[PDB]
Write a protein that binds this ligand. Structure first.
Ligand SMILES: NC(=O)c1ccc[n+]([C@@H]2O[C@H](COP(=O)([O-])OP(=O)(O)OC[C@H]3O[C@@H](n4cnc5c(N)ncnc54)[C@H](O)[C@@H]3O)[C@@H](O)[C@H]2O)c1
Ligand SMILES: NC(=O)c1ccc[n+]([C@@H]2O[C@H](COP(=O)([O-])OP(=O)(O)OC[C@H]3O[C@@H](n4cnc5c(N)ncnc54)[C@H](O)[C@@H]3O)[C@@H](O)[C@H]2O)c1
Ligand SMILES: O=C(O)[C@]1(O)C[C@H](CP(=O)(O)O)[C@@H](O)[C@H](O)C1
Ligand SMILES: O=C(O)[C@]1(O)C[C@H](CP(=O)(O)O)[C@@H](O)[C@H](O)C1
Ligand SMILES: [Cl-]
Ligand SMILES: [Zn+2]
Ligand SMILES: [Zn+2]
Lengths: 381, 380
């Protein structure tokens, strides 16, 4: 299995088949506990927990007293990133017989909705317990399972309450992608694309060249696209791990991972749950690249490559994309609404709105988000 | 200059009579620079103490550009506020400001431990964490709760089950707040002082026995004697926290009395206070160490008497407790059920702090005790 260090810990392990062959034993040996709590959603639990339940019994066969594996199946989708579902999980763990205690090892089996919600549960449970990430979506493998950011949403916006809590293990198993719906694979590509745009022209170029091939494999899995798939995923995870190790708590550099997200999160607060995170970030990347162009920092040629590359992977580049309009029931994303939502962006320095600006594909303007005047933002909205 | 105490490698603790009137505002402006200061307090305290500070704040921020804002939130007093709803209500109020409070916010916890625990916990998860400072206004908060970063809320099942370790940037201890503290609350805080001495200093325990009469006379109507008992408790906790911040062993000692105590408190709150429940928990956990042959009977008597000399309850049968909880009783089964939720437990193994003598723990961590042994000291 491939390993990636983050924050001085060898916590990322990647290999096809980890969930079938490695995770249970590795939990029993490196995350020794009497109590394991597996959190997942109802779309994937019945597909993927049966095998693990069996792997667990076998791995725990010579441990005495016998440890227990307890399972919580949450509703799928963004609506589960809420105060209520966080409380519900907590209440159920506390209600176990005996209750789940400080030795508990929590296992986030799912995409970024389950990872963000479960990692936040683990961060405050009795003041904190160990957890691991088992990313099952492309988005989670390339971005959300890595780095420790956890959160829930409130009615005002995205991820406003949460905590930075690092997982003890991050198991990346590409076999999960075999059952991942087409729209979700495409949704995840927005974060892959973003990560390349903030770090490498060559990696961005590889993504452009690979689009047709990958998309055909996705809509037809991946036997014939296996090496390119692995390389684009590893390039995203490794860059993210670099940035986080240098700036875990976002005093500067980690701002860069939020490219596309100042306008993207402002759109998402309105368009969720009908439109996905990556879809919202794609429109946010286009607008924020348009803003950099407006400010003279980014070349028009660069804005066109960003637009085309997102479109080549099937992502939306406009709030008026017809696939978006078929799903949103006439929702409005007016300029005033979007500005109000951007005042809740966590990167803001007091009332100064801070947005990531690119100076070229692969190169950020600054090693942090920049302050941008409200009037300039209003132009691209 | 005020007295400073180091904790976790920084001189975060600052103590002097009058700090709130003369030092805090300026110190926050220079050392916790921000555009937005959010003060959280309870309605008993706010109207007394915030007006002076509002003025001090404006004064201190006069040369600052742009001028910073001070926003205040007054919560209902008492344990009822350490809840999921009240945490969400403060968070919603912060996010609803114009403009919203952001990551630069400096939160000020002006109050006893209820306000400290709640406010600290809000700070720890707000936008994934903002700076905060503690301004302890009760004796309990000056000698124990404002120090060390443990924050939390309760749930209907028990005490402090959800929370976080989040250290304050400053801890300002101003004895002037004790001028208005109700007698019952002063006595409540003395349980944590007595506990702190019993787990680590027979000298301090002796000083508390010797000064009880004088301290209580003053409460019910010595400054150097009081200041010394407060400073001894705080320094002992700062050493423990600096050494074992996340409670891998040594910090368990600060929970002496609390395995049984928090089990009682889950039943008797909000009518009976934390210190009051911990006082009974100290007696029962001492009896338990006696039962296990670890603690001598004479030491148990000495603990009971010291608690009573300060006016704390030493049994569930205490007449005053019975008067405030008419209709509420603590069963052995309910206590045992509640102890299963204790955060020090290792899986199902209950862990309790055992003392081998006044001033000396059996070991420098909580010890596993069989369920059938714990049950024998739980009756009234
Ligand atoms: N913490 C971070 O650093 C971070 C980074 C990026 C995005 N995010 C968050 O990520 C969330 C989006 O995550 P997501 O896109 O993974 O959503 P998700 O977890 O809801 O998963 C997407 C969908 O796919 C289903 N699914 C998941 N794995 C599957 C599999 N292997 N086979 C079949 N179906 C499967 C799910 O049930 C769900 O319907 C947002 O809430 C966003 O804010 C967080
Ligand atoms: N985090 C920790 O390390 C820690 C340590 C010990 C106890 N605790 C927690 O502390 C809490 C108890 O705190 P507390 O006893 O300070 O309670 P509290 O904050 O409710 O204050 C006690 C009462 O005195 C009032 N008051 C406070 N200061 C006053 C003043 N100067 N003048 C007049 N009235 C004043 C308050 O309104 C309240 O009615 C419990 O919830 C307990 O679990 C936490
Ligand atoms: O710092 C990160 O890990 C992120 O910037 C974190 C954001 C969530 P945040 O803006 O709430 O921190 C995530 O959506 C993004 O893809 C990567
Ligand atoms: O470690 C501490 O600071 C304490 O043990 C923390 C407890 C609360 P906890 O048992 O919820 O950690 C507090 O009541 C006690 O007086 C001191
Ligand atoms: Cl919370
Ligand atoms: Zn994102
Ligand atoms: Zn206590």
């Amino acid at each position: 299995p491939t390993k990636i260090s983050i924050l001085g810990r060898e916590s990322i392990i990647a290999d096809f088949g980890l969930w079938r062959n490695y995770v249970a034993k590795d939990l029993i040996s490196d995350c020794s506990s009497t109590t394991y709590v597996l959190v997942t959603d109802t779309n994937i639990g019945s597909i993927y927990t049966p095998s693990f339940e069996e792997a667990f019994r076998k791995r725990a066969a010579e441990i005495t007293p016998s440890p227990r594996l307890l399972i919580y199946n949450r509703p799928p989708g963004e609506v589960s990133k809420s105060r209520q579902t966080k409380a519900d999980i907590e209440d159920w763990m506390l209600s176990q017989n005996p209750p789940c205690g400080r030795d508990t090892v929590v296992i986030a089996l799912g995409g970024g909705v389950i990872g963000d919600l479960t990692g936040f549960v683990a961060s405050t449970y009795m003041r904190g317990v160990r957890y691991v990430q088992v990313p099952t979506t492309l988005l989670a493998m390339v971005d959300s399972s890595i780095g420790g950011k956890t959160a829930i949403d409130t009615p005002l916006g995205k991820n406003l309450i949460g905590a930075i809590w690092q997982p003890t293990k991050i198991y990346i198993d590409l076999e999960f992608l075999e059952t991942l719906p087409v729209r979700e694979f495409i949704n995840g590509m927005a974060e892959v694309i973003k990560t390349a745009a903030i770090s490498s022209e060559e990696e961005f170029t590889a993504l452009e060249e690979n689009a047709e091939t990958i998309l055909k494999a996705v809509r037809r899995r991946f036997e014939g696209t296996e090496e390119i798939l692995k390389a684009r995923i590893l390039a995203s995870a490794r860059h993210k791990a670099y940035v986080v190790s240098a700036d875990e708590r976002e005093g500067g550099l980690r701002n860069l991972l939020n490219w596309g997200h100042s306008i993207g999160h402002a759109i998402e607060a309105i368009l969720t749950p009908q439109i996905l995170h990556g879809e919202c970030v794609a429109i946010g990347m286009v607008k924020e690249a348009e803003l950099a162009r407006h400010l003279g920092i980014l070349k028009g040629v660069a804005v066109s490559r960003i637009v085309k590359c997102l479109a080549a992977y099937g992502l939306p580049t406009s709030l008026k994309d017809a696939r978006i309009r078929k799903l949103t029931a006439g929702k409005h994303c007016s300029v005033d609404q979007l500005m109000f939502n951007m005042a809740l962006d966590k990167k803001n320095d007091g009332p100064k709105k801070k947005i990531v600006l690119l100076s070229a594909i692969g190169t950020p303007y600054e090693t942090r988000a920049s302050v941008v005047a409200n009037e300039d933002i209003r132009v691209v909205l």
